[PDB]
Amino acid sequence: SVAHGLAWAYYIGYLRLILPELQARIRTYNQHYNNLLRGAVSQRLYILLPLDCGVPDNLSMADPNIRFLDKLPQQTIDRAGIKDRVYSNSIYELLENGQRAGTCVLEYATPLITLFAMSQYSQAGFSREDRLEQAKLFCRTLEDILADAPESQNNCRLIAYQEPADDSSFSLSQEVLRHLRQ
Amino acid sequence: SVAHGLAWAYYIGYLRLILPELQARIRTYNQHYNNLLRGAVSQRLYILLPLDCGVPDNLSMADPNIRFLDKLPQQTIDRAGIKDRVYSNSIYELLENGQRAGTCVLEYATPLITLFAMSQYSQAGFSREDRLEQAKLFCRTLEDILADAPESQNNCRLIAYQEPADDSSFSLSQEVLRHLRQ
Ligand SMILES: Cc1ccc2c(=O)c3cccc(CC(=O)O)c3oc2c1C
Ligand SMILES: Cc1ccc2c(=O)c3cccc(CC(=O)O)c3oc2c1C
């Protein structure tokens, strides 16, 4: 199964690398730019999982109620298969009814890009129906990995959603706010 | 298939983001530091694919006839799912009888880390035998992808190899040089 392997790859090649020092990075940021923030970023990493596998080029453009505010200070990673790579995470403001309702570190799950690409390329032998099935499977597998994972406790949140196409009353910031509220 | 999706993920999420500007980065290196390197690094990316999926902490330590020389100039990435990310590549010295015999951009394919991990974790439901079969299928699938991929014509080379178990005296250094010499 591609989703099974993708979930493990996403965990092994990203999440178990980024999550250990994430809560430290967020506390550090909440220390030094506190005068600037007049608030506090939340502790967890919020990962967007659109089931249609539609990943935009820029998250800032994706919803007018989600707004880029700041970068976390970087993290260079020193491991096998990874040498001197610079990882950065972005911090977003979430608006509700014109007002700031939350601030969190937020990003899309990259393997959805691969699932989407696989459905476009004929050499991959992957249909658009295969795609939705695999995306749900990817979400559930990853969910299960993180439940039992030493690195993943209390510091990572999966936000999976299906977007109606295309009455489009959907709000991405509403969906994130629903998880943030806890 | 796990390998099928890992190969596509490696192409979609690394190789096609890195290959397009590789030669230019190398060409550019062969100038600014031509006086420092006193030679030339070859222009392709050499990807090591150990079938036993053993990927070392430091390649430099996998064979002592493989020594780290220098880093390439950095590339920043502007794609979807990957804003403000800094990628570097490494140049290695290959030794033969104590002297330099070649210079190349060299790295292990990361999905083999994932294949290895999956064989170690119960939750992955993935055996040692599953691992070797999938590693072979990964190489074949990746080959097929690169053969017809726009970004991957003539700037990439796969070095798949199987370590004998009888003699613990196989030479990665020599294997890489065997490809290099053409
Ligand atoms: C741009 C892009 C696209 C797809 C993947 C991916 O499938 C994928 C799968 C497993 C692990 C990674 C590593 C990462 O998210 O940095 C992956 O990264 C991808 C990236 C960076
Ligand atoms: C450290 C590590 C381990 C495993 C993968 C991986 O499986 C994997 C699979 C597909 C794509 C990527 C992205 C990359 O190699 O930068 C992947 O990256 C990994 C990395 C960076």
Short mmCIF file of C-alpha atoms in Angstrom, two decimals, chain B residues 94-157:
data_model
loop_
_atom_site.label_atom_id
_atom_site.label_comp_id
_atom_site.label_asym_id
_atom_site.label_seq_id
_atom_site.Cartn_x
_atom_site.Cartn_y
_atom_site.Cartn_z
CA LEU B 94 37.24 8.72 -3.05
CA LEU B 95 40.54 7.17 -2.11
CA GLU B 96 42.53 4.45 -3.79
CA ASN B 97 45.81 3.44 -2.18
CA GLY B 98 45.64 6.48 0.08
CA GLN B 99 45.30 9.06 -2.68
CA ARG B 100 42.38 10.83 -4.28
CA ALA B 101 41.00 8.89 -7.24
CA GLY B 102 37.77 10.76 -7.76
CA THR B 103 35.47 13.48 -6.51
CA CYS B 104 31.69 13.40 -6.51
CA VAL B 105 28.39 14.54 -5.11
CA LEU B 106 27.26 11.53 -3.20
CA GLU B 107 24.36 10.57 -0.98
CA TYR B 108 22.21 7.70 0.21
CA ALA B 109 18.61 7.43 -0.88
CA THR B 110 16.52 8.31 2.18
CA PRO B 111 13.57 5.94 1.65
CA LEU B 112 15.89 3.05 2.56
CA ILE B 113 16.04 4.54 6.02
CA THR B 114 12.27 4.23 6.01
CA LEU B 115 12.38 0.64 4.70
CA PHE B 116 14.82 -0.26 7.45
CA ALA B 117 12.74 1.38 10.18
CA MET B 118 9.58 -0.36 9.01
CA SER B 119 11.33 -3.71 9.37
CA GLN B 120 12.24 -2.75 12.94
CA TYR B 121 8.81 -1.57 14.11
CA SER B 122 6.04 -4.01 15.01
CA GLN B 123 3.38 -1.51 14.07
CA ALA B 124 4.55 -1.41 10.47
CA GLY B 125 3.79 -5.12 9.94
CA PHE B 126 6.84 -5.42 7.75
CA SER B 127 9.37 -8.23 7.87
CA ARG B 128 13.03 -8.53 6.98
CA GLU B 129 12.08 -10.51 3.86
CA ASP B 130 9.53 -7.89 2.91
CA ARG B 131 12.37 -5.40 3.22
CA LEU B 132 14.78 -6.94 0.72
CA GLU B 133 12.04 -7.53 -1.85
CA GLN B 134 10.76 -3.98 -1.48
CA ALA B 135 14.24 -2.49 -1.72
CA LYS B 136 14.75 -4.19 -5.06
CA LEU B 137 11.35 -3.04 -6.26
CA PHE B 138 12.19 0.49 -5.13
CA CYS B 139 15.35 0.57 -7.27
CA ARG B 140 13.55 -0.75 -10.34
CA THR B 141 10.67 1.66 -9.93
CA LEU B 142 12.93 4.63 -9.36
CA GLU B 143 14.96 3.70 -12.44
CA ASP B 144 11.79 3.65 -14.55
CA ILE B 145 10.70 7.00 -13.22
CA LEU B 146 14.02 8.70 -13.89
CA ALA B 147 14.39 7.24 -17.37
CA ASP B 148 11.46 9.28 -18.63
CA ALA B 149 11.44 12.18 -16.17
CA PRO B 150 12.00 15.74 -17.58
CA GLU B 151 14.20 16.78 -14.66
CA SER B 152 16.31 13.65 -14.46
CA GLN B 153 18.01 13.29 -17.82
CA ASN B 154 21.77 12.87 -17.50
CA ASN B 155 22.39 14.36 -14.05
CA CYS B 156 21.65 11.44 -11.80
CA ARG B 157 22.98 7.94 -11.37
#
